[PDB]
Amino acid sequence: GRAIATHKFRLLEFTAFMEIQRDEIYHRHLFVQLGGKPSFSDPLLETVDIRQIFDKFPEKSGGLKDLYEKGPQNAFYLVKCWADLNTDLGDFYGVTSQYESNENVVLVCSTIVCSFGKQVVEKVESEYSRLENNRYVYRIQRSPMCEYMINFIQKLKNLPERYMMNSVLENFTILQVMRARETQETLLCIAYVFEVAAQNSGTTHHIYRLIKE
Amino acid sequence: RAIATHKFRLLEFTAFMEIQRDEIYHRHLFVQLGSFSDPLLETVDIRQIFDKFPEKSGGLKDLYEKGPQNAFYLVKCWADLNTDLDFYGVTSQYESNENVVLVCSTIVCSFGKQVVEKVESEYSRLENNRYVYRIQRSPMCEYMINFIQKLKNLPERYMMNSVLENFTILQVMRARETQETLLCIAYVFEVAAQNSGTTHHIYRLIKE
Amino acid sequence: TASQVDEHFSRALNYNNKSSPMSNRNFPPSFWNSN
Amino acid sequence: TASQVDEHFSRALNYSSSPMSNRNFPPSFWNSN
Ligand SMILES: CCCCCCCCCCCCCC(=O)O
């Protein structure tokens, strides 16, 4: 246990960003970035009790508790992000996702944006693999962020205090659920919780295994 | 139920719940939609339903004006709420004569305001000289599950129809690359009679 | 959440007695008869 | 929608859910570094 992966499916990349053109010069500000490079230089994962985050995600049928109990439980992860909001504000807000699968599945990637544990918008993408170096790789590159997210980020920067940004982000979560179309099995599930990075720092995160001890 | 244009058609739309009792599955259909020979559909003036859906930019009026106008439909549903309320979901199937990437946006509206949205993208498979898009067992949002359980527990059956009076669902199917509207279905609802299953009527929307 | 569904129900039912109804709009007779 | 973003900021800034600081998380959860 060292990465967001099972024995047969792994996250290769998750990057949230905004592209900015100014004086005919383009630059990309990274709000959040998770890599997936697998090596001996990766520390072992800490665990978090999933019962502590149930009220921040959808509940009832198909919610987090139900998906976790259906399992496999080792496919469940919690990511605590320090989103980098140290950027001025024509701009493009996008996301890039990349995955690797041992089997040639049709990958159904669901992303739910939550406010106070309730879904606001769910984006579902059903991707096919590409053979890259004999591996089944799935990419959803520079996919547009929905208007809700764009407005949310823009409004966070209006807050005069970082404590207000953190109170507002305390009830803002994203739940990712990756499924194989044919079996409908959960391949991977990532819950995201947020805080704002310090003004002198870029984005940082911690990955936790979700356990129900 | 043939909801079809010159190039795109809805083959199936089933909202249902599944339960596992004594290791045996049981399914109940709340709504079910879905032949190359049908009589002419009845028409409905789109102006009669504008106030039940968002009216801002990209709203139903703006979408209809942009067209094609042969892609706008109104579905009146008698939802079957007679069951002992585990999975809640939607299975849908679509057919195209051109292999575009399907992007289906579904919004739930309360008094003409969006409460929740789902956006789903699907690629086609050529099957028997037609391109097929399938969205099997798409999990229902918590709002809808909560809404259905609260609706069936109302003490008076007339109240179920009063609550459904300003509850609507708008679906906009688009071709990803061109952003062309392939189909747009506005949904309005009533509760089916106790001894009956789900029924529905389909209307072509026109600017009367 | 339950509260968001509750707000719709509360506004629609108007228990405490705090736009044309669908029944009075221009729809074909089939719109009101399931059969 | 924009109105839903505003609804979120109003509820969040209105200072039945325990604060995250009062839940059981390891000390790394509170340390960006
Ligand atoms: C409220 C009773 C009548 C409506 C019941 C069936 C509605 C069709 C399914 C709606 C699904 C919306 C999208 C989603 O929740 O993922």
Describe the model.
The complex is a heterotetramer, with 1 copy of chain A (213 residues), 1 copy of chain B (208 residues) and 2 copies of chain C. Chain A has 213 residues and is mostly beta strands. Chain A has helices at residues 64-70, 147-156, 162-169, and strands spanning 9-22, 25-35, 46-49, 76-83, 92-101, 107-115, 118-127, 130-132, 135-144, 172-180, 186-196, 204-211. Chain A is globular. The two termini of chain A are 17 Å apart. With 208 residues, chain B is mainly beta. Chain B has one domain (1-208). In chain B, the strands form 2 sheets. Chain B has a 7-stranded mixed beta sheet. In chain B, strands 1, 2, 3, 6, 9 and 10 form a 6-stranded antiparallel beta sheet that branches. The radius of gyration of chain B is 17 Å and the shape is globular. Chain C is mainly alpha-helical and 35 residues long. The longest helix of chain C is centred in the first third of the chain and has 12 residues, at 2-13. Chains in contact: A-B, A-D, B-C. The complex binds myristic acid (MYR). Residues 15, 30-31, 79, 90, 106, 108, 118, 140-141, 144, 147-148, 151, 169, 189 of chain B line the site of myristic acid (MYR).
If you compute it from the alpha carbons, what radius of gyration of chain B comes out, rounded to the nearest whole angstrom? 17 Å
| Backbone structural class of chain B | mainly beta
How many domains is the backbone of chain A divided into?
1
Distance from N terminus to C terminus of chain B (CA atoms, Å) equals 24 Å
The topology string of helices and strands of chain B comes to EEEEHEEEEEEHHEEE
Bound molecules: myristic acid
User: What is the CA-based Rg of chain A, rounded?
Assistant: 17 Å
The fraction of residues in strands of chain A falls at over 45%
Structural class from helices and strands of chain A?
Answer: mainly beta
Measured by residues with Cβ under 8 Å of the partner chain's Cβ, the largest interface is: A-D, 29 and 23 residues
Main location (chain B): nucleus
Organism (chain B): Drosophila melanogaster (Fruit fly)
Protein name (chain B): Protein scalloped
Subcellular location (chain B): Nucleus
